[PDB]
Amino acid sequence: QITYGPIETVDNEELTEADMLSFISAAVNSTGLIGYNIKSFDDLMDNGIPQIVKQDVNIERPQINL
């Protein structure tokens, strides 16, 4: 039950096509140039490997550390 300013109130006629590229920049910065691959590997190692081996064991950093 949270409202927002009236639609007619918003004043963005000055907005230009070049300005919208700020949105693209924000999207790329947040998501990143590339991602979700290291994320999938990390989630696997953290949860799937324990969950999968169950059906406690964990892998430490590769090693003398290399």
Curated annotation (Swiss-Prot):
Induction remarks: Expressed in the late phase of the viral replicative cycle.
Q: Where in the cell is it found?
A: Host cytoplasm; Virion
What is its quaternary makeup?
Answer: Part of the viral DNA-directed RNA polymerase that consists of 8 polII-like subunits (RPB1, RPB2, RPB3, RPB5, RPB6, RPB7, RPB9, RPB10), a capping enzyme and a termination factor.
Q: What is this protein for, i.e. what is its function?
A: Catalytic component of the DNA-directed RNA polymerase (RNAP) that catalyzes the transcription in the cytoplasm of viral DNA into RNA using the four ribonucleoside triphosphates as substrates. Forms the polymerase active center together with RPB1. Part of the core element with the central large cleft, the clamp element that moves to open and close the cleft and the jaws that are thought to grab the incoming DNA template.
Q: What else is known?
A: The binding of ribonucleoside triphosphate to the RNA polymerase transcribing complex probably involves a two-step mechanism. The initial binding seems to occur at the entry (E) site and involves a magnesium ion coordinated by three conserved aspartate residues of the two largest RNA Pol subunits.
Entry's family note? Belongs to the RNA polymerase beta chain family.
Entry protein name: DNA-directed RNA polymerase RPB2 homolog
Organism of origin is African swine fever virus (strain Badajoz 1971 Vero-adapted)
